[PDB]
């Protein structure tokens, strides 16, 4: 019963700090049996005047079915959703299964990720696409095009593209990069031209997207419909989760 036990797999992201160190942390497995591997909660099903009468179920995206997602909206709500996605993944998946990278011309917003092992380089926070491409050359060398979803190859890489830079094209083509999912925050045309990858916000925090099948993640309509009332994690909530995970790692 996935809807009955949804709080064990996809809870509200501000509950994750208190749950750090529980047996649900880093429990996801790329074994072909865990259908939540590579899945991340983005929000809830209730919205507007219907919030009080709709049984709220989590809404999610799979990292394995698209080479990227493009978050289109106002700066703060786009950052809030990205922080919720990062916190969800850092809690549910171990850094041996999911690694993370941020490429941003706004470093002040990403200082909190210094506590997460997922961003540790064997810190994967870069200020330009050129610096990122030099540091991550070994990641991209020999990698083919993205193949949408047996055992999943690991680590999967989640990259936050937060810099409007024409050099993005020379790193991520239309075919995508195998084992990587980008999340664009800029709203530039190269990311937003594919409709099945767009998450369009409205001022209330509701996102619309092409609906997908609940079991296969396959797109089921070519027009955008309600997708989720997004989860929003503030800098303080994200830093609280990140520091709590860091203290668990030191203990």
Residue numbers in the entry: 124 to 166, 166A, 166B, 166C, 199 to 274, 284 to 310, 316 to 417
Please quote the authors directly.
Type VII secretion systems (T7SSs), also referred to as ESAT-6 secretion (ESX) systems, are AAA+-dependent molecular machines that are found in the Actinomycetota phylum and have gained great attention due to their implications in cell homeo­stasis and host–pathogen interactions in mycobacteria. Among them, ESX-5 is found almost exclusively in slow-growing pathogenic mycobacteria, where it participates in nutrient uptake, intracellular colonization and modulation of the immune response during infection through the secretion of a large family of protein effectors: the PE and PPE proteins. EccC is a pivotal component of the pore complex, providing the secretion driving force via the hydrolysis of ATP. In the ESX-2 to ESX-5 systems, EccC consists of two N-terminal transmembrane (TM) helices connected to two additional helices (the stalk region) and a domain of unknown function (EccCDUF), which are followed by three FtsK/SpoIIIE AAA+ ATPase domains, here referred to as D1, D2 and D3.
Here, the crystal structure of the MtbEccC5 DUF domain is reported at 2.05 Å resolution, which reveals a nucleotide-free structure with degenerated cis-acting and trans-acting elements involved in ATP binding and hydrolysis. The C-terminal α-helical lid present in other prokaryotic AAA+ domains is missing in the structure, which is flanked by two parallel helices (αA and αB) and a two-stranded antiparallel sheet (βA–βB) that connects to the stalk domain. This structure is conserved in both molecules present in the asymmetric unit (r.m.s.d. of 0.173 Å for 218 Cα atoms). The proposed ATP-binding site should be located at the N-terminus of the α1 helix and the C-terminus of the β3 strand, which are expected to contain the P-loop and the Walker B motif, respectively. Sequence analysis of the Walker A motif shows a highly degenerated and one amino acid shorter sequence (GEREQVL231) that is missing the conserved G2 and G3 glycines as well as the Lys and Thr/Ser residues that are key for ATP/Mg2+ stabilization (Val30 and Leu231 in). Altogether, this points to variations of G2 and G3 as structural factors responsible for the extended α1 helix observed in .
